Design a protein around this ligand. Structure first.
Ligand code: LG6
Ligand code: LG6
Ligand code: MG
Ligand code: MG
Lengths: 213, 215
């Protein structure tokens, strides 16, 4: 079954705790959004893991360069997974993975923005086993919706051997679109953080997921 | 015009960054809060440094990839002068960051680290972006990738496109002559200045060399 991941795109830790104190036990993965990494620094990862050690903590650092330096900082802060932006040099993705192996963590390729299938092949050959298919937030606000092109690419990535995470302003009604595909993880940020009842929002995703998968 | 000198502070903590700034703040033109420092300390790095050097241009190398209006605003509210947007970012992300930049009389730079296309370069121009950072990846450098004709060609073409170009990537004094004849806007030095026996003398040697090759 696809796991449920909550994106913490808050600017301060106290803001993030308003959400985790409610749904921490309702999700599988607690992500330190890029906005939180830049707002508080890597201490966000260290503090959240200390609070929820039984959960998977993802540092959405979107590493672009200095792969072994930035990943080591996240894993030393106890992160389980870290993200590497899709346009990073292949040596950058490789370095982060090498470090991740030292901590028994893992690396994800953030497919935010422009990327190609040739790069996708390179990531496989490098040994990367996870990708995050992301519909850009700025793109969404510009009227961009989910479509067949996305479904097709997602299926293709899956056929390549990647464990695929789908994210990007996902609402409970968007789940049916991905039925049939073995999605590894579904990410929900605003739809859970900003719902009237975050707990009900989280449980409904879980419910819908178990029902469709 | 003479290319300016910018020091990249890719430190993990503020105190480590200050060991350098207390020495060369007045020897360089632009003080950069490297990505590593941002992730290490958070946006407070930008605010503290600007309060220390208000007369200097402070760049936040945030490498914005999405949520361009939110992240840029965070950096600008912390008093950054310039912010960087990673090259693969959706064009709307770059536009949104630029829109916020105008509100704070700041500016945006497209960070050319990794894979990008000329078609994308045209879009940045159309969007009104005036600065790009040609970067030779640090991980590629360690992999044995040196500065070559391929880079010079691209840099020249970006310059002809109307972009003010910044060059960076493990630059050493020996590499500067490779860019002679090109109207480079800024030369960024990180390790070559932070790790020298005498950072002050390292910074001055870069300046002297720049004045000699571009004067
Ligand atoms: O670009 C970013 O860093 C976020 O906008 C993005 O990764 C975000 O964390 C999404 O993955 C989940 O958040 P939403 O469901 O609210 O889009
Ligand atoms: O990718 C990064 O964040 C840095 O590795 C990179 O931007 C760095 O700041 C260089 O631009 C300057 O540093 P060096 O001269 O040491 O390569
Ligand atoms: Mg995220
Ligand atoms: Mg930098």
């Amino acid at each position: 079954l696809p796991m449920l991941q909550v994106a913490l795109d808050n600017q301060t830790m106290d803001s993030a705790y308003e959400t985790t104190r409610l749904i921490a036990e309702e999700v599988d993965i607690i992500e330190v959004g890029t906005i939180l990494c830049v707002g508080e620094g890597v201490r966000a990862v260290r503090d959240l893991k200390a609070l929820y050690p039984h959960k998977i903590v993802l540092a959405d650092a979107k590493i672009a360069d200095a792969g072994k330096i930035l990943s080591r900082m996240c894993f030393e802060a106890n992160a389980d997974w870290v993200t590497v932006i899709c346009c990073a040099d292949i040596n950058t993705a490789k370095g982060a993975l090498d470090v991740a192996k030292e901590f028994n963590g893992d690396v994800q390729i953030e497919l935010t923005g422009y990327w190609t299938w040739e790069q996708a092949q390179q990531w496989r050959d490098a040994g990367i086993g996870q990708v995050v298919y992301h519909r850009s937030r700025d793109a969404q606000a510009a009227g961009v919706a989910w479509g067949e092109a996305d479904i097709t690419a997602i299926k293709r990535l899956s056929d390549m051997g990647f464990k695929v995470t789908v994210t990007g302003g996902l609402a409970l009604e968007d789940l049916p679109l991905f039925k049939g595909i073995p999605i590894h993880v579904f990410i929900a940020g605003r739809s859970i953080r900003d719902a009237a009842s975050p707990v009900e929002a989280a449980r409904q995703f879980k419910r819908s997921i178990a029902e469709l998968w």
